Symmetry: none
Amino acid sequence: SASAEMITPALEGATLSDGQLKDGGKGIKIDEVVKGSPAAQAGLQKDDVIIGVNRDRVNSIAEMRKVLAAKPAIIALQIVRGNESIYLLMR
Amino acid sequence: PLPSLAPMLEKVLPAVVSVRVEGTQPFEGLGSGVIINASKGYVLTNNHVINQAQKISIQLNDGREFDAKLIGSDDQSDIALLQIQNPSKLTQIAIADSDKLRVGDFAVAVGNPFGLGQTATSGIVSALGRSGLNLEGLENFIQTDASINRGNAGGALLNLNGELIGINTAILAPGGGSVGIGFAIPSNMARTLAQQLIDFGEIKRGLLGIKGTEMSADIAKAFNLDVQRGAFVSEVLPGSGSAKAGVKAGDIITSLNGKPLNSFAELRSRIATTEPGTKVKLGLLRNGKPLEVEVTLDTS
Amino acid sequence: PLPSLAPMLEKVLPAVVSVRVEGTQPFEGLGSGVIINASKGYVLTNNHVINQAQKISIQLNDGREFDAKLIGSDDQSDIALLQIQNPSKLTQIAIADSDKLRVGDFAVAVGNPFGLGQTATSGIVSALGRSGLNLEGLENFIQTDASINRGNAGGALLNLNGELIGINTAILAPGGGSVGIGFAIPSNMARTLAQQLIDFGEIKRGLLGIKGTEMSADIAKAFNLDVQRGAFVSEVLPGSGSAKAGVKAGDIITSLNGKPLNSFAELRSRIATTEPGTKVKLGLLRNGKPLEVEVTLDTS
Amino acid sequence: PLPSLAPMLEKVLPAVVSVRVEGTQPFEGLGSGVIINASKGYVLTNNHVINQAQKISIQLNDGREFDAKLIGSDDQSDIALLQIQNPSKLTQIAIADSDKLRVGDFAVAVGNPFGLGQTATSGIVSALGRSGLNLEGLENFIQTDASINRGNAGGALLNLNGELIGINTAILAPGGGSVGIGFAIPSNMARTLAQQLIDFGEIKRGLLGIKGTEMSADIAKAFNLDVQRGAFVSEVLPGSGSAKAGVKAGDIITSLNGKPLNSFAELRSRIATTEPGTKVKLGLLRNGKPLEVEVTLDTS
Amino acid sequence: SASAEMITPALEGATLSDGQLKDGGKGIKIDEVVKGSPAAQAGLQKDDVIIGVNRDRVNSIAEMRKVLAAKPAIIALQIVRGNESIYLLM
Amino acid sequence: SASAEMITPALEGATLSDGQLKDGGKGIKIDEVVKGSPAAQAGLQKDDVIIGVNRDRVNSIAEMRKVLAAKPAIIALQIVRGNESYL
């Protein structure tokens, strides 16, 4: 489980790994979040499964890193917390 | 023969009053107010003029003095309604539709600056729909360059016919004095809030159950769009009216009941005006495709 | 085709001049003035512009320069009169009736702000009969919201016909610059005092023999009265004309020459303007009963 | 029915834009600009707003955002020209003749004070040809009393027809807020400099070859002269066109092209604007004798 | 002699007594004025006799105390310095 | 050597002497100008020849003193640095 700090400053304090959804769809599962960290500030929580960045779909930490290597202005994670859909936003 | 505003100000000035407040170490404060109902003595004023008062007095511009009682108050919109005890020979203002205003219309501000007494100043409407000043929970301000100073809060903003178009609330001042940037609450929202306070004694806020942020061109360049004004939807709370209606995250609200939105705080204030149980129309754009949605309001 | 103030300002601006004062560490001061007699070169200005001058110079807006002498002055009303040596090709102002002014009339201020040169600004008449600023002995000011700054003292306040309605005399501001609250001496008092100075060289001040306080809505509640504005007489000095008339301690002054009195300061200033030996009629209120009392003034 | 500036403002407002600048500790600045060519996206702005930018962005009043590139600048006159990258559906302003302006004309200032957004204020023209403020090398300012604050530089000053008459440049403020004294570059100078920047990329300044000082009532009182406004010439640089024309030291310059000169700075700016190689008419006053002199301008 | 501060804080600095006028009318003769006291600042002087509070007549210190126990918004003292009538505002 | 300080302080630091022009006309040749003195600030230079005060024509240091005893408003000197001619 690579620490999310190295990928981007905004995800400091979040533990990300390559996991699975309830239905088998691939996604990146959030393992542990530091209280007060920017990940906690943005709304990331335990056992969240991110699905897509903007109009994309990320199935691995490497895929997310390749997407983020271009360093876009803003990030929006379609995320998955519970059986519904929420967007997030940080710079 | 010479043009002037004197003929119309003669019939209107008696409706604007001065509000004197004492309370607590004791304090004394001064503000303005507008007579809304002459028979029942209802006075519209600002909420921070009255906040910590134990005694409230009203003074007419001819010298008469009355005692007042607080009927209701709105801290989010900063609007208070007082009642005059034993009213006698009062004059009331007429209210204009502030949805028909435009930038460039002429305006008159009547108030009580620095405790000097009743004063009228003149200017134009500089802007509409101003918000984001981190002043109140609700901001849909009219901007004007009529001179507005300390003691003017609660007073009247009028057009050339002498009809109410705003309630003076705030100024932007680098050094504690007027530089020509003043803000007013539009009269439609103020009238609706005053009627709710009269009818029920407190406000019933309706909520959409949608959490979202301001739309911009930066986001439009991230979702391949053309619209740069509106509200961006991010969270749909469970079981709300919009959740039942089918509104999902990632969408953009453009028009409310067919009226295009220029801000997200604009939509917030418009929804806060609406009473719960009403059905509203949302013009939506999801994945670049437009739609029309009917929504039932909740209760806050 | 387009509306403008230029056609009437083209004829009036030569009458407003700049006043330069050198005195004594020495100081150099700046103000304005208005030419009222073109053949004799009489110039009306403020008293605190000329207060401790050792030499006075006058500049026209075309560049010509003159030396000036003080004919007389009045400290209580803050009015001074100068005469130009060897005048030639001058323009004079016409004086309007300031008793016909109303709140909402349009006004133009002409002066010399910050030593820049001749400058015109525009506004409305905000209020009438203002006092209590503790500036001079007599205060019956016109309150206007034209931009008025340092160097505008002594200068002109005009109506849309180009006639003088006031002499700019003061301002209120936390930061030292205009916020839209300026004060002017009305033209009737200034004209009367200037005529007195021309004719005799000193002011002729009349008094009533009444010492009293300002009537409020509180004193009208302790004697069970109705009118809340006027003057409350508490001392009638022995041997005065008012004593011969029959004014006693405790009554209320309501009208001067039939015109209702807005304040006690207005009564004081209007009495001080009037010439000793004149006869006035006072509308008196005693024990809830109205009366009319004829009083002959004495000399100060 | 009611008079307003709204009908004419609705057509001109899209042509005034806000200018956001990022530069270098990193800094962000804000100002305004005017669209003078819609097909090419040419934007007139102030030089000190754009000074140390690394990136420039233009934002329209409907929300669209564009990138801009500097075309040219003029530090003495403080005028900058930008081009919009990839323009689409723009509105442009119409320019008026600023040599026909008079004191008392009505004016509207459109800008972006304190970063709030597009704002309009109203006033009159207070003075013409102001200078001596020691802000730029060449000053021939229009003075106005519309409210102009921080963020207004580069924006529009318009007449009642919606035609450009000036570019807002500076203010005089004791405490960092507007007190009613603002300055604008006249539109004739601005349009000439803009054409020069478009055609050549830099300004071609012409000079006379004369060193002199301002005329006053004191110098004229020593040479027994009547005039008191104009230019007093003290040195004629050898080899110049003026020396070839015969202009000597001690002469008084009265009129340029038959139009009266009110100061040395007006003559300086008017000569600087005129293109090199052009011929000009000088009204000379030497030993009290008038002369007409033809001068051919050189290159600076 | 009676203390005037106990009657009201306004009349601090006045020495009082039940007195009589020149024509025999009963009043409140001022006997000592403290310099700098509120009584001196208001304008009370020696030998002054108060024949009124607001719209009433006070015949003794007790009656004035009874009227002032209501604590009115202001006080209006007829006094009688000289063979005349001077009002006061408290 | 006539010091210019008590003649007029505006010419302080300028050494004055009765001389003649290149054609033999009379005037005052400025022998020395002290750097930072009021004369240098006003524009006086070494070897300058003042040949006029305001409109009047002057010839000697005594004539300078007699003219400037009245203390006029402004003195517009003519002077003649090189073969050309105000301060």
